[PDB]
Coordinates of C-alpha atoms and ligand atoms in Angstrom, one line a residue:
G1 CA 55.5 56.6 133.7
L2 CA 52.4 56.0 136.3
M3 CA 54.5 57.9 139.1
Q4 CA 52.8 61.1 139.9
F5 CA 54.6 63.6 142.4
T6 CA 52.3 65.2 145.0
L7 CA 52.7 68.0 147.6
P8 CA 50.9 68.0 150.9
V9 CA 47.8 69.9 150.6
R10 CA 48.9 73.5 151.7
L11 CA 51.8 73.5 149.0
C12 CA 49.5 71.6 146.3
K13 CA 47.3 74.7 146.5
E14 CA 49.7 77.7 147.6
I15 CA 52.2 76.6 144.7
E16 CA 49.9 77.8 141.9
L17 CA 49.8 81.4 143.6
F18 CA 52.6 83.8 142.4
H19 CA 53.6 84.6 145.8
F20 CA 54.3 81.1 147.0
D21 CA 57.4 80.9 149.2
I22 CA 59.2 77.3 148.6
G23 CA 60.3 77.2 152.4
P24 CA 63.3 76.4 154.3
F25 CA 63.5 72.7 153.6
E26 CA 66.1 72.3 151.0
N27 CA 65.5 68.6 150.5
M28 CA 62.0 69.3 149.0
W29 CA 62.9 72.0 146.4
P30 CA 63.9 69.0 143.8
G31 CA 60.6 67.5 144.5
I32 CA 58.8 70.9 144.1
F33 CA 60.8 71.7 140.7
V34 CA 59.6 68.1 139.2
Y35 CA 56.0 68.7 140.4
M36 CA 56.2 72.0 138.3
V37 CA 57.7 70.3 135.2
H38 CA 55.0 67.7 135.3
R39 CA 52.0 70.0 135.7
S40 CA 53.3 72.6 133.3
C41 CA 54.9 70.3 130.5
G42 CA 53.4 66.9 131.2
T43 CA 54.6 63.7 132.9
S44 CA 56.2 62.7 129.7
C45 CA 58.5 65.9 128.9
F46 CA 61.8 64.4 130.5
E47 CA 63.1 60.7 131.3
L48 CA 62.5 60.8 135.2
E49 CA 66.3 59.1 135.7
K50 CA 67.9 62.0 133.3
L51 CA 65.8 64.7 135.1
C52 CA 66.5 63.9 138.5
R53 CA 70.3 63.4 137.8
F54 CA 70.3 66.7 135.9
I55 CA 68.6 68.5 138.8
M56 CA 71.2 67.2 141.2
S57 CA 74.2 68.2 139.2
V58 CA 72.7 71.6 138.7
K59 CA 72.1 71.9 142.6
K60 CA 75.7 70.7 143.1
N61 CA 76.9 73.5 140.7
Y62 CA 75.3 76.5 142.8
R63 CA 77.6 77.7 145.6
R64 CA 76.4 78.5 149.2
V65 CA 76.5 82.4 148.8
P66 CA 73.9 84.2 150.7
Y67 CA 71.5 85.2 147.6
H68 CA 72.7 83.8 144.4
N69 CA 72.2 80.0 145.5
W70 CA 70.1 77.0 144.9
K71 CA 67.1 78.5 146.7
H72 CA 67.1 81.5 144.3
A73 CA 67.2 79.1 141.2
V74 CA 64.1 77.4 142.4
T75 CA 62.1 80.2 143.3
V76 CA 62.8 81.9 139.9
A77 CA 61.6 78.5 138.3
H78 CA 58.5 78.8 140.3
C79 CA 57.5 82.3 139.4
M80 CA 58.2 81.1 135.7
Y81 CA 55.9 78.0 136.4
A82 CA 53.0 80.5 137.7
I83 CA 53.3 82.7 134.6
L84 CA 53.0 79.7 132.2
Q85 CA 50.1 78.2 134.0
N86 CA 48.2 81.4 134.0
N87 CA 48.9 81.8 130.1
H88 CA 48.8 78.2 129.4
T89 CA 47.8 78.5 125.7
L90 CA 50.3 81.2 124.4
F91 CA 53.3 79.2 124.5
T92 CA 54.9 76.1 122.6
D93 CA 55.8 72.8 124.1
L94 CA 59.5 73.6 123.5
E95 CA 59.1 77.0 125.2
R96 CA 57.4 75.6 128.2
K97 CA 60.2 72.8 128.6
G98 CA 63.3 74.9 128.3
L99 CA 62.2 78.2 130.2
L100 CA 61.8 76.3 133.5
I101 CA 65.1 74.6 132.8
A102 CA 66.4 78.0 131.9
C103 CA 65.5 79.5 135.3
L104 CA 66.9 76.6 137.4
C105 CA 70.0 77.0 135.4
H106 CA 70.2 80.9 135.2
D107 CA 72.7 81.7 138.0
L108 CA 74.8 78.5 137.9
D109 CA 78.2 78.7 139.6
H110 CA 77.7 82.2 140.6
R111 CA 80.1 83.7 143.1
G112 CA 78.2 86.3 144.6
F113 CA 79.9 89.3 142.6
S114 CA 78.3 91.7 139.8
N115 CA 79.7 91.4 136.2
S116 CA 81.0 94.7 137.3
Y117 CA 83.4 93.5 140.0
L118 CA 84.8 90.7 137.9
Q119 CA 85.9 93.2 135.3
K120 CA 87.3 95.4 138.0
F121 CA 89.3 92.5 139.5
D122 CA 90.4 91.3 135.9
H123 CA 89.1 87.6 136.5
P124 CA 89.6 85.2 133.8
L125 CA 85.9 85.0 133.0
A126 CA 85.9 88.7 131.9
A127 CA 88.6 88.2 129.4
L128 CA 86.6 85.2 128.0
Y129 CA 83.0 87.1 128.0
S130 CA 83.4 91.1 128.0
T131 CA 79.7 91.7 128.3
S132 CA 77.0 89.7 130.3
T133 CA 80.0 88.2 131.8
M134 CA 78.5 85.9 134.3
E135 CA 75.3 85.2 132.2
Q136 CA 77.4 83.9 129.4
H137 CA 79.3 81.8 132.0
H138 CA 75.7 80.6 133.4
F139 CA 74.6 79.3 129.8
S140 CA 78.0 77.6 129.5
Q141 CA 77.7 75.8 132.8
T142 CA 74.3 74.5 131.7
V143 CA 75.5 73.1 128.4
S144 CA 78.6 71.5 130.4
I145 CA 76.0 69.7 132.5
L146 CA 73.7 68.7 129.8
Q147 CA 76.8 66.8 128.2
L148 CA 77.6 64.6 131.2
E149 CA 76.7 61.0 130.6
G150 CA 73.0 60.3 131.8
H151 CA 72.1 64.3 132.0
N152 CA 70.9 65.1 128.5
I153 CA 67.2 65.6 129.5
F154 CA 66.6 66.6 125.8
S155 CA 68.1 63.4 124.4
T156 CA 64.5 62.6 122.7
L157 CA 64.2 65.8 120.7
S158 CA 64.6 66.0 117.1
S159 CA 67.9 67.2 116.0
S160 CA 65.8 70.6 115.0
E161 CA 63.9 71.0 118.3
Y162 CA 67.1 70.5 120.2
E163 CA 69.0 73.4 118.8
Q164 CA 65.9 75.6 119.3
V165 CA 65.4 74.8 122.7
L166 CA 69.1 75.6 123.5
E167 CA 68.7 78.8 121.7
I168 CA 65.6 79.6 123.7
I169 CA 67.5 78.7 127.0
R170 CA 70.8 80.8 126.1
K171 CA 68.7 84.1 125.0
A172 CA 66.6 83.5 128.3
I173 CA 69.6 83.4 130.5
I174 CA 71.3 86.4 128.9
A175 CA 68.4 88.4 129.4
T176 CA 68.7 88.1 133.2
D177 CA 71.6 90.5 132.8
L178 CA 69.8 93.5 134.1
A179 CA 71.8 95.9 131.8
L180 CA 69.9 94.6 128.9
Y181 CA 66.4 94.8 130.7
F182 CA 66.3 98.6 130.1
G183 CA 66.7 98.6 126.4
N184 CA 64.5 95.4 126.3
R185 CA 61.4 96.9 128.2
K186 CA 61.6 100.4 126.4
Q187 CA 61.2 98.6 123.0
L188 CA 58.5 96.4 124.4
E189 CA 56.7 99.3 125.9
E190 CA 56.8 101.2 122.4
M191 CA 56.0 98.1 120.3
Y192 CA 52.9 97.4 122.4
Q193 CA 51.5 101.0 122.7
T194 CA 52.1 101.5 118.7
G195 CA 50.0 98.1 118.2
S196 CA 53.1 96.7 116.4
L197 CA 53.8 93.9 119.1
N198 CA 53.6 90.4 117.0
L199 CA 53.8 87.2 118.9
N200 CA 54.6 85.1 115.6
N201 CA 57.5 87.5 115.0
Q202 CA 60.3 85.3 116.9
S203 CA 62.3 88.4 117.8
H204 CA 59.2 89.6 119.6
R205 CA 58.6 86.3 121.2
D206 CA 62.1 86.8 122.3
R207 CA 61.7 90.2 123.8
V208 CA 58.7 89.0 125.8
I209 CA 60.5 86.1 127.2
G210 CA 63.3 88.3 128.3
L211 CA 61.0 90.2 130.2
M212 CA 59.4 87.2 132.0
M213 CA 63.0 86.4 132.8
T214 CA 63.7 89.7 134.7
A215 CA 60.1 89.2 136.3
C216 CA 60.9 85.8 137.6
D217 CA 64.5 86.9 138.6
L218 CA 63.1 89.8 140.6
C219 CA 60.2 88.0 142.3
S220 CA 61.5 88.4 145.8
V221 CA 59.8 91.8 145.6
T222 CA 56.2 90.2 144.6
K223 CA 56.2 88.1 148.2
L224 CA 54.6 88.7 151.4
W225 CA 56.4 91.5 153.0
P226 CA 58.6 89.3 155.6
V227 CA 59.8 87.2 152.7
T228 CA 60.6 90.4 150.5
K229 CA 62.5 91.9 153.8
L230 CA 64.4 88.9 154.7
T231 CA 65.4 88.4 151.1
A232 CA 66.6 92.0 151.1
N233 CA 69.2 90.8 154.0
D234 CA 70.7 88.2 151.8
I235 CA 70.9 90.5 148.8
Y236 CA 72.6 93.3 150.8
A237 CA 75.1 90.6 152.4
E238 CA 76.5 90.0 148.9
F239 CA 76.5 93.6 147.8
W240 CA 78.4 94.9 151.0
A241 CA 80.9 91.9 150.6
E242 CA 81.5 93.1 147.0
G243 CA 81.7 96.6 148.5
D244 CA 84.4 95.4 150.8
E245 CA 86.2 93.7 148.0
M246 CA 86.1 96.8 145.8
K247 CA 87.5 98.7 148.7
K248 CA 90.2 96.1 149.1
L249 CA 91.1 96.9 145.2
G250 CA 91.3 100.5 146.3
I251 CA 88.0 101.7 144.8
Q252 CA 84.9 103.5 146.4
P253 CA 82.1 101.4 145.6
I254 CA 78.5 102.5 144.7
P255 CA 76.4 103.4 147.9
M256 CA 74.5 100.2 147.1
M257 CA 77.5 98.3 148.0
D258 CA 78.7 100.4 150.9
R259 CA 77.7 99.0 154.3
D260 CA 78.6 102.3 155.6
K261 CA 75.3 103.3 153.9
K262 CA 73.0 100.9 155.4
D263 CA 70.9 104.0 156.9
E264 CA 70.1 104.8 152.9
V265 CA 68.5 101.3 152.2
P266 CA 64.9 102.3 152.2
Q267 CA 65.7 105.1 149.8
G268 CA 67.4 102.7 147.4
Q269 CA 64.8 99.9 147.6
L270 CA 62.3 103.0 146.7
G271 CA 64.6 103.9 143.6
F272 CA 64.9 100.2 142.8
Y273 CA 60.7 99.6 142.9
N274 CA 60.2 102.8 140.9
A275 CA 63.1 102.5 138.4
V276 CA 63.1 98.6 138.0
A277 CA 60.3 96.4 139.4
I278 CA 57.4 98.5 138.9
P279 CA 58.0 99.2 135.3
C280 CA 58.9 95.5 134.8
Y281 CA 55.7 94.1 136.2
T282 CA 53.8 97.1 134.5
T283 CA 54.9 96.2 130.9
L284 CA 54.5 92.4 131.7
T285 CA 51.0 92.8 132.9
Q286 CA 50.2 95.0 129.7
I287 CA 51.6 92.2 127.7
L288 CA 50.2 89.0 129.6
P289 CA 47.0 90.3 131.6
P290 CA 46.8 87.4 134.0
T291 CA 50.4 88.5 135.4
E292 CA 48.7 91.4 137.2
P293 CA 49.1 89.8 140.7
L294 CA 53.0 90.2 140.5
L295 CA 52.2 94.1 139.7
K296 CA 49.8 94.2 142.6
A297 CA 52.0 92.5 145.1
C298 CA 55.2 94.6 143.8
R299 CA 53.0 97.9 144.6
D300 CA 52.1 96.5 148.0
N301 CA 55.9 95.9 148.9
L302 CA 57.0 99.4 147.7
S303 CA 54.4 100.7 150.0
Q304 CA 55.8 98.6 152.8
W305 CA 59.2 100.3 152.1
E306 CA 57.7 103.9 152.1
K307 CA 56.5 102.7 155.7
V308 CA 59.8 101.8 156.9
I309 CA 61.2 105.0 156.1
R310 CA 58.3 106.8 157.6
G311 CA 59.6 105.1 160.9
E312 CA 56.0 103.0 160.8
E313 CA 58.0 99.7 160.9
Ligands
IWN401 C1 70.0 94.6 140.8 O1 69.0 94.2 141.7 C2 68.9 93.0 142.0 C3 67.8 92.6 143.2 C4 66.8 91.6 143.0 N1 65.9 91.7 143.9 N2 65.8 92.9 144.5 C5 65.1 93.3 145.7 C6 67.0 93.4 144.1 C7 67.6 94.7 144.8 O2 67.5 95.0 146.2 N3 68.2 95.8 143.7 C8 68.7 97.2 144.3 C9 68.8 98.1 143.3 C10 69.4 99.4 143.5 N4 69.6 99.7 145.0 N5 70.2 101.0 145.5 C11 70.4 100.6 147.0 C12 71.0 101.7 147.8 C13 71.5 102.7 147.3 C14 72.1 103.6 148.3 C15 72.1 103.3 149.8 C16 71.8 102.2 150.3 C17 71.1 101.1 149.1 N6 69.8 99.1 147.2 C18 69.6 98.6 146.0 C19 69.1 97.4 145.6
MG402 MG1 72.3 86.4 137.5
ZN403 ZN1 69.3 85.3 139.3

């Protein structure tokens, strides 16, 4: 109860910033996560034994793929932690608790292939979940881990709260299906400009949390240029492996996934920042003003990619 987690001074300060990078030292990521739950939620949100056991069954069920791994899980959870600290009074105790848990869990047991590939390969997960295939698998793994003995970090919630937290987490994890982002952001844009956006309306809270989730998921683009650039290598190492595999099933893959189309990567980063990230961070800044530094940083990295194309690095 009387056991603070700290962090050395550079981390203690840089962690509160949106562009913080959790670094190359794996063995600190759990302590970083716990440090965030504590400052965001209080030392009393979670029995320390149950949380430490949950954090390590989660870690152990992420795979060692180049991008969709334990380090992405914690990065995503960090960005969420930033958003919540900068808007601390807009969210319930249940929302704060389950959204960081949602983010640590959001890619559980990912294999490093798109929903798309699962369906083209006819993987059993695509027979059991026809849309948001991996994302329903993700929530499903989270519940599995939650039901291991000693793992139920939610044990001490009323029966009511418990069902509402699992519903927040479920909805939150589904939202990271980027195919649902476009619909969601459009409606949020319109609802905001027609002054109809109502945060006591629960289905409006849902769309906002959906958007935060996309924001945190995509936060590689809000980092210092060299973090942004080296993360894109990891991203393409998955995409081009998926492409290879498409080819092995006898299918031309989309250019994104074709390692014979490396030369066009800056062009596709631009498309990506213009069709996806900029609009994501724009609407989110409109809705939660103190998220602006994600927007600002995202535009800086768009401008670094432009610089690449022009041969200026
Ligand atoms: C779904 O995105 C996940 C994600 C998360 N964080 N980031 C930076 C990404 C991310 O790079 N996305 C995208 C999107 C669209 N294209 N098109 C290309 C491309 C097209 C033609 C030729 C070569 C490449 N490369 C990407 C990368
Ligand atoms: Mg995912
Ligand atoms: Zn993710």
